[PDB]
Amino acid sequence: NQMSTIAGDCLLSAAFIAYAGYFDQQMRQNLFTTWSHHLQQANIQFRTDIARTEYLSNADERLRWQASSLPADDLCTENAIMLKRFNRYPLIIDPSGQATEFIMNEYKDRKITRTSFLDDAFRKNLESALRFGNPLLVQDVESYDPVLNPVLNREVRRTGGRVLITLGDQDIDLSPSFVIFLSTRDPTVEFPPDLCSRVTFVNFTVTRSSLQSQCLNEVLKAERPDVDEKRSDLLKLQGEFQLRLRQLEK
Amino acid sequence: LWSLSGDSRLKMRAELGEYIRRITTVPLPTAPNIPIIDYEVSISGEWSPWQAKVPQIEVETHKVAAPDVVVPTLDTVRHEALLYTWLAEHKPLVLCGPPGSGKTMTLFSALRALPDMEVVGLNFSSATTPELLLKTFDHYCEYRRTPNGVVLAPVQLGKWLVLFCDEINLPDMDKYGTQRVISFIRQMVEHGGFYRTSDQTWVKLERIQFVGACNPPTDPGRKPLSHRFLRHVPVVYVDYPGPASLTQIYGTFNRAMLRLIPSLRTYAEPLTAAMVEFYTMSQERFTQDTQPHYIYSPREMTRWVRGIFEALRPLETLPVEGLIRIWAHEALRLFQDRLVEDEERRWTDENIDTVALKHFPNIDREKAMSRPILYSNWLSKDYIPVDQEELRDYVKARLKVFYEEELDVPLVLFNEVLDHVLRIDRIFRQPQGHLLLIGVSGAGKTTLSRFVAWMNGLSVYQIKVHRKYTGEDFDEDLRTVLRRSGCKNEKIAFIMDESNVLDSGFLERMNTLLANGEVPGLFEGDEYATLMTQCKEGAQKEGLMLDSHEELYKWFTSQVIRNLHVVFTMNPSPALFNRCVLNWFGDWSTEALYQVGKEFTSKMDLEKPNYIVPDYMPVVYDKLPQPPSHREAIVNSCVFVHQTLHQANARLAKRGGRTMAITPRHYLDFINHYANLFHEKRSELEEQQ
Amino acid sequence: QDLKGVWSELSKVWEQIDQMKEQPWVSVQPRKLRQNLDALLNQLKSFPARLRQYASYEFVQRLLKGYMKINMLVIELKSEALKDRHWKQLMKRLHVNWVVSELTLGQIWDVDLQKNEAIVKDVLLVAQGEMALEEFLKQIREVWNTYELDLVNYQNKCRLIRGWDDLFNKVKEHINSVSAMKLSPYYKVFEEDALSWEDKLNRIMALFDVWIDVQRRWVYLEG
Numbered sequence A: 001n002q003m004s005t006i007a008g009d010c011l012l013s014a015a016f017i018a019y020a021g022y023f024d025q026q027m028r029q030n031l032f033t034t035w036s037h038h039l040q041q042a043n044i045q046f047r048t049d050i051a052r053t054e055y056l057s058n059a060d061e062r063l064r065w066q067a068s069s070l071p072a073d074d075l076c077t078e079n080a081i082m083l084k085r086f087n088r089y090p091l092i093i094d095p096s097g098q099a100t101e102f103i104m105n106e107y108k109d110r111k112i113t114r115t116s117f118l119d120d121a122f123r124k125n126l127e128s129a130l131r132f133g134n135p136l137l138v139q140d141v142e143s144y145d146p147v148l149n150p151v152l153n154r155e156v157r158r159t160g161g162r163v164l165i166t167l168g169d170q171d172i173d174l175s176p177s178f179v180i181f182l183s184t185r186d187p188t189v190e191f192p193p194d195l196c197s198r199v200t201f202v203n204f205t206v207t208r209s210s211l212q213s214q215c216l217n218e219v220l221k222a223e224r225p226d227v228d229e230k231r232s233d234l235l236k237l238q239g240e241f242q243l244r245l246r247q248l249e250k
Numbered sequence B: 001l002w003s004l005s006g007d008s009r010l011k012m013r014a015e016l017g018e019y020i021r022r023i024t025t026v027p028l029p030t031a032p033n034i035p036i037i038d039y040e041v042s043i044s045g046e047w048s049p050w051q052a053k054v055p056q057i058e059v060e061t062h063k064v065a066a067p068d069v070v071v072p073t074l075d076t077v078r079h080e081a082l083l084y085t086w087l088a089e090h091k092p093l094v095l096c097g098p099p100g101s102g103k104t105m106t107l108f109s110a111l112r113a114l115p116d117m118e119v120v121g122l123n124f125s126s127a128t129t130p131e132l133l134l135k136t137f138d139h140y141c142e143y144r145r146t147p148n149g150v151v152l153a154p155v156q157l158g159k160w161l162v163l164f165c166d167e168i169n170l171p172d173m174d175k176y177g178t179q180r181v182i183s184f185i186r187q188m189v190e191h192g193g194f195y196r197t198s199d200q201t202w203v204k205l206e207r208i209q210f211v212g213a214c215n216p217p218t219d220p221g222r223k224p225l226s227h228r229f230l231r232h233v234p235v236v237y238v239d240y241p242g243p244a245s246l247t248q249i250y251g252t253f254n255r256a257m258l259r260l261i262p263s264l265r266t267y268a269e270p271l272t273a274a275m276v277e278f279y280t281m282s283q284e285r286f287t288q289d290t291q292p293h294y295i296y297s298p299r300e301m302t303r304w305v306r307g308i309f310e311a312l313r314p315l316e317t318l319p320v321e322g323l324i325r326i327w328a329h330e331a332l333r334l335f336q337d338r339l340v341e342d343e344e345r346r347w348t349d350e351n352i353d354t355v356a357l358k359h360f361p362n363i364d365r366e367k368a369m370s371r372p373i374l375y376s377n378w379l380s381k382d383y384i385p386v387d388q389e390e391l392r393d394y395v396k397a398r399l400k401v402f403y404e405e406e407l408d409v410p411l412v413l414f415n416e417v418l419d420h421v422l423r424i425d426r427i428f429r430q431p432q433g434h435l436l437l438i439g440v441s442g443a444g445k446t447t448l449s450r451f452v453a454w455m456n457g458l459s460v461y462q463i464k465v466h467r468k469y470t471g472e473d474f475d476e477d478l479r480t481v482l483r484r485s486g487c488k489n490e491k492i493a494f495i496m497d498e499s500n501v502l503d504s505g506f507l508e509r510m511n512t513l514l515a516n517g518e519v520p521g522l523f524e525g526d527e528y529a530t531l532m533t534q535c536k537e538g539a540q541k542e543g544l545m546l547d548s549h550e551e552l553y554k555w556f557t558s559q560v561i562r563n564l565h566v567v568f569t570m571n572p573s574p575a576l577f578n579r580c581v582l583n584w585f586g587d588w589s590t591e592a593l594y595q596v597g598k599e600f601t602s603k604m605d606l607e608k609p610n611y612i613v614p615d616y617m618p619v620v621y622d623k624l625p626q627p628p629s630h631r632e633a634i635v636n637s638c639v640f641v642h643q644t645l646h647q648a649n650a651r652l653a654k655r656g657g658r659t660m661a662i663t664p665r666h667y668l669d670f671i672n673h674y675a676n677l678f679h680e681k682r683s684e685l686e687e688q689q
Numbered sequence C: 001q002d003l004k005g006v007w008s009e010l011s012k013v014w015e016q017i018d019q020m021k022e023q024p025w026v027s028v029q030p031r032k033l034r035q036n037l038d039a040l041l042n043q044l045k046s047f048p049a050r051l052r053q054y055a056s057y058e059f060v061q062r063l064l065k066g067y068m069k070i071n072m073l074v075i076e077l078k079s080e081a082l083k084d085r086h087w088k089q090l091m092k093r094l095h096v097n098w099v100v101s102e103l104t105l106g107q108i109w110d111v112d113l114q115k116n117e118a119i120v121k122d123v124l125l126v127a128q129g130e131m132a133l134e135e136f137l138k139q140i141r142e143v144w145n146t147y148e149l150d151l152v153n154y155q156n157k158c159r160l161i162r163g164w165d166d167l168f169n170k171v172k173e174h175i176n177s178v179s180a181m182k183l184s185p186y187y188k189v190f191e192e193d194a195l196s197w198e199d200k201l202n203r204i205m206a207l208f209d210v211w212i213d214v215q216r217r218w219v220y221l222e223g
């Protein structure tokens, strides 16, 4: 049965993690509802009332993120999922510093380095990170540096059994396991379409719907712990209980 | 008449003529139909029409629509008389009018017609300073102390140096509302000299004139000239040539061009009439209010004639069918691909075939009835009509080779891609100077430009601008590309985007090259000497010799105008938008998204034999089967997802705003995520099974 | 018979090909090589259709067609790219023992350049990168060996150095570009030379930074 209903769920999750970024919680929910309604109109077998939080990441990554100083908000978990599974380098938009601290604690093992566009040594830190496969974080993306166009476009001049990338007049080896996380502080910034197309917008700005969801979750956890436990059981029932049963079988 | 309201439109000239007729008592042209402005006064003392002094010229077949050739007409002869009148008294004058109206080139012709006048062309940029004038004086003139004071005069004896300064109003005003170069010219015109900063003495100009030309001050980037300077310089409004002048000039051009094939000499006049009618109608609609690039000028009709001549040059024994086919195809490539809305496009096509029938009703409706009307010299050996399917197969094979060799990301060829490849190829083949591409980011302008450059053997040069770029580096790269295109016969395709351009200094260096094919300001000192030396070596390669150094620069310029093709891109200037062939590379349509989804999800396994065909859910109007299968339904759902993001962005813009643009790169990302996630989940579940 | 005639023609073509391949690689002009190969192909096409159906003629024609295809690789190989170390890498990878002085086009044509296109292209790209960096070091070398400090008289007392901005801009640009190749992947080839030139540039920078201050203070105190 799960094999019978895979394609629609994958389509929905991919559309969510590729398109439904930069949108507030109600907008993401409305878009997902529209997509699911269209799939129902097309008789595409997608798992009914799927939750994207645990479809794309089971329990261990969620616990690791929680231990990595990440808020328990549903929007924050969705943004963390986007950060985990991305093709274009993410552009974090957070009025608070929660997202930066989370992505910093997450990549300490990989030696993530702080840098900003206003720094004069930004370029030097850039090629330093690009050599040893060191993750790089850039702040103040309002003053975007056009020198990042070759790396954002992921252009590869592979030749002679090795991978190449051109940075200005200089050529640098494109080390593997290299990720860059553009970040910003101002929730209201107008990026050019050239920069917009090359990044996956990950919005952390608190809106009416996000705060409403946070308050609802908090009041359910406090006032009626039984209902919160039942909801957590429902969320686990898709993947976590099956994983535990598979491990007990093994 | 020619001084009062001599810088106004035709209607205002007619109004002043009527008022003068009302108030004056002098005899006037008795004809009540022709305005007095079209008459002149003969030395006998009688009003004679300007038409009688317009000669009929017959330019060479090989010189049709030449960049420098001049066809005399009423406007040309009237303005030539006015320029001779105002150059006899050495009064500087400015020719002001809309872009492409025929000011700069006509001014060149009139100035070079005189035998005792030496013409120097200076392109006034947005950063023009009197240092440019001082450099020009140093290069062309000399300082002489023998008279009462120091005197600046041209080296050549008996020659009056005319410093033609087009775009005279372009130089920027400072913080206090003045232009330094304009004040310098005003000082050197009113007083007759200037103070040299070397030793602070008053040098006096002799045998130096000034002539200007500019677009209207209301146009973007144009600063109105100071009244203290305008007091000295009369201005003439050189407006767009009228239907009569257009018919005469382009009838002459068509009669010259069609002499290659004698079978269509009798069709020259109706062809010219059809072109002028279509140009007039396409100028009536598509005003600059609708879109900033909807500017039309006789440059468009010049390109229209030049393209037809280029297509007819190798071909022999062509019937009227091919002639009108090429006419319609050039009309499509000049008046149709610059458009945005499909209603405008269909309006253009219907008007084209309507006019073709209006002036050629006897012809069979099979040339205009034919829908593809696309040519390609790629198939066969020359520029001939080709069917879409064979061309599609050929370009698919060539792109297979291409994404095998560089650009490893796959490409899908929907019809729009093929059309844009054809257009870009057409621009590259002709000895032109630019191809400007405008469209949404990530849609594929640069990719297709590179692909066509690879087909046509064009090298690719892209400036990798950083945060610490400068104008000197950009000019050096320009000169480098020119030397690779001028000193070496290698054909370059300079690829730049709006991201690389920061200041207006990076611009108008385009426009001067686009209208001319060379940038004189880049070559100086040892750089100019090295340019001449490498041009001499390239001449040895071509079989020429050192010859003249100025002729070395001329050969460089010809090589650049024939080889170099800069391509430049923006996301959606009245001059740059007329010196370029603008191709609207819009966002991918529903069919394009459908084809992208179908080929980029082909490896995915979505064959479900028990799929129950639903109702509704229409997104792709041309569904491949009438009853869709699972694969078609899923691709339709994907394009529906993209369309819903477009609609959500539009709605969010309507209610407040604060939206981010959705691009085809987002569609590629969505498809890649879909494929990767589906493969991962399928593999995990199969492993569990 | 016809078979004997086509055998004689094949022998003549083989003799022509061998005589041409006797040309050493140093003196093989790619343009003239392509022209002569086209002439040989036209000579082959001049044979009658009956002689063209023979298997040996087809093999010779397709071998010449492959030579024409790899002529681009011949052009790319006979450049200022390969020098001899890249030729040594090609010899090591292809496991053939040629002689550089005795190298001829016949030896290179015996080894399948079309089959070894990837190896040849990798060697060519490595040789390209090295040339760029080596030429850049040569430029730096030429600039700093032909650089002269401008001197301007000062009250008929001495000739102070003029042009501080130009020298400092040149030094800063060179230092940044030296760091830049130190970032390059082909930099391991020119590593020691880049280090030496960086040390020289650092010494120059440290000298002139003090020199300009001494000049300014000295002129102030002189006034």
Ligand SMILES: Nc1ncnc2c1ncn2[C@@H]1O[C@H](COP(=O)(O)OP(=O)(O)OP(=O)(O)O)[C@@H](O)[C@H]1O
Residues within 6 Å of the ligand: B066, B067, B069, B070, B071, B072, B073, B075, B076, B097, B098, B099, B100, B101, B102, B103, B104, B105, B106, B166, B214, B215, B241, B245, B249, B298, B299, B302, B515, B575
């Ligand atoms: N009367 C005419 N005689 C000859 N050519 C003409 C005439 N009217 C228009 N043209 C043609 O139209 C074009 C006008 O080009 P020209 O450079 O003179 O325009 P412009 O208005 O002075 O341009 P800009 O302001 O950009 O310098 C040329 O292709 C020219 O051949």
Ligand SMILES: Nc1ncnc2c1ncn2[C@@H]1O[C@H](COP(=O)(O)OP(=O)(O)O)[C@@H](O)[C@H]1O
Residues within 6 Å of the ligand: B409, B410, B411, B412, B413, B414, B417, B439, B440, B441, B442, B443, B444, B445, B446, B447, B448, B569, B596, B665, B668
């Ligand atoms: N017809 C097409 N089919 C598939 N992918 C395409 C097509 N056109 C463009 N692309 C994709 O778009 C990406 C970027 O396009 P690009 O040429 O940078 O757009 P722009 O010229 O607007 O910057 C490329 O990586 C390419 O894979």
